[PDB]
Design a protein around this ligand. Structure first.
Ligand SMILES: NC(=O)c1ccc[n+]([C@@H]2O[C@H](COP(=O)([O-])OP(=O)(O)OC[C@H]3O[C@@H](n4cnc5c(N)ncnc54)[C@H](OP(=O)(O)O)[C@@H]3O)[C@@H](O)[C@H]2O)c1
Length: 324
């Protein structure tokens, strides 16, 4: 039970994938192997997560010309970190990921963010005051260097992560290799309808990260409301005899949006992919659609005067200034 969408490159990309953000080492390995046993065929990774090494070890014993899962039947994604936007660094950054992942090619390689950070070995270049010392490379230059990778057959498809509609069109206006996927935060509170309509218009499929709301991200502490716990989600969870998260994921699945739910919990892993045997009626979709309130949770902290404000909102290539 795992449907998929067809990318413009002709690749079959499963609607459900295994997220690995914060899936620390000594934990993601166990998660990966079990996920594969339960049907997962789509794994979502990132160099910044600092766990691709352990992921490579899991795939080294579950995927191969002998294991239970053929390499070609797996869809592996990864992303180019912000400190590797300079054209020169792009291939070394990709290769490194392949080394850690122990693969010969990625099925999808995404630019993690449209804005760059000072190049170097420090994933988070700060200075004195502790502020992030950015870089000025434009995403279009990083993108052309990313295209050379598809040429060398190191990556089958390219995509964008955290890009705005304007930035997406900016890449499309000069692309020799067109983005196949747009990965953004997406769930009932941030439905991304406008962006989704935009991508459909540009031939890009949409991947939703933090589909459950990230439960509490790597930084958050409001007080309410909580995506899970919304009465509609609970009502549907009761009606279809499924967990609140399955309801959130099914919602995305039903509207053809790819989801890469993250989990290192044995009992949730199989549940997060088991969202293909039930369906919501049009009215229930409407009810879930009504939860939309253009609210995004995956943004910075850099607390200032007892106030939470975006840390990188100052970057000229910041993706969240425009409506979408
Ligand atoms: N491109 C980007 O910029 C970007 C950024 C961030 C993340 N991502 C990707 O998106 C993936 C998922 O996003 P996300 O991890 O932020 O959030 P998410 O998948 O919405 O939520 C993950 C949290 O939900 C819990 N959870 C998982 N399944 C559950 C279930 N069935 N019921 C209740 N709780 C459940 C997890 O706990 P346990 O693990 O303890 O089960 C974890 O604390 C990441 O792993 C990563 O691959 C991409």
């Amino acid at each position: 039970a795992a449907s998929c969408v067809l990318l413009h490159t002709g690749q079959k990309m499963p609607l459900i994938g295994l997220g690995t953000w914060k899936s620390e080492p000594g934990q993601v390995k166990a998660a990966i192997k079990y996920a594969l046993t339960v049907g997962y065929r789509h794994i979502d990774c990132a160099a910044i997560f600092g766990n691709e090494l352990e992921i490579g070890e899991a795939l080294q014993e579950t995927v191969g010309p002998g294991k239970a899962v053929p390499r070609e039947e797996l869809f592996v994604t990864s992303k180019l970190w912000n400190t590797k936007h300079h054209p020169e660094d792009v291939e070394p950054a990709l290769r490194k990921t392949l080394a850690d992942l122990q693969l010969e090619y990625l099925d999808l390689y995404l630019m993690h963010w449209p804005y760059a950070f000072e190049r170097g070995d420090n994933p988070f270049p700060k200075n004195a005051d502790g502020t992030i010392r950015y870089d000025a490379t434009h995403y279009k230059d990083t993108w052309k260097a990313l295209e050379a990778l598809v040429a060398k057959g190191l990556v089958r498809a390219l995509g964008l992560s955290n890009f705005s509609s304007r930035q997406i069109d900016d890449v499309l206006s000069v692309a020799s290799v067109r983005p196949a996927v747009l990965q953004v935060e997406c769930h009932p509170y941030l439905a991304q309808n406008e962006l989704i309509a935009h991508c459909q218009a540009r031939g890009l499929e949409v991947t939703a990260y933090s589909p459950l709301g990230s439960s509490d991200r790597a930084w958050r502490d409001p007080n309410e409301p909580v995506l899970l716990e919304e009465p509609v989600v609970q009502a549907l969870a009761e009606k279809y005899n499924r967990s609140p998260a399955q309801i959130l994921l099914r919602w995305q699945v039903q509207r053809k949006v790819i989801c890469i739910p993250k989990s290192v919990t044995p009992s949730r892993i199989p549940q997060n992919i088991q969202v293909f045997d039930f369906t919501f009626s049009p009215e229930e979709m409407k009810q879930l659609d009504a939860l939309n309130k253009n609210l995004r949770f995956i943004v910075p902290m850099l607390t200032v005067d007892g106030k939470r404000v975006p840390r990188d909102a100052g970057h000229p290539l910041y993706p969240f200034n425009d409506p979408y």
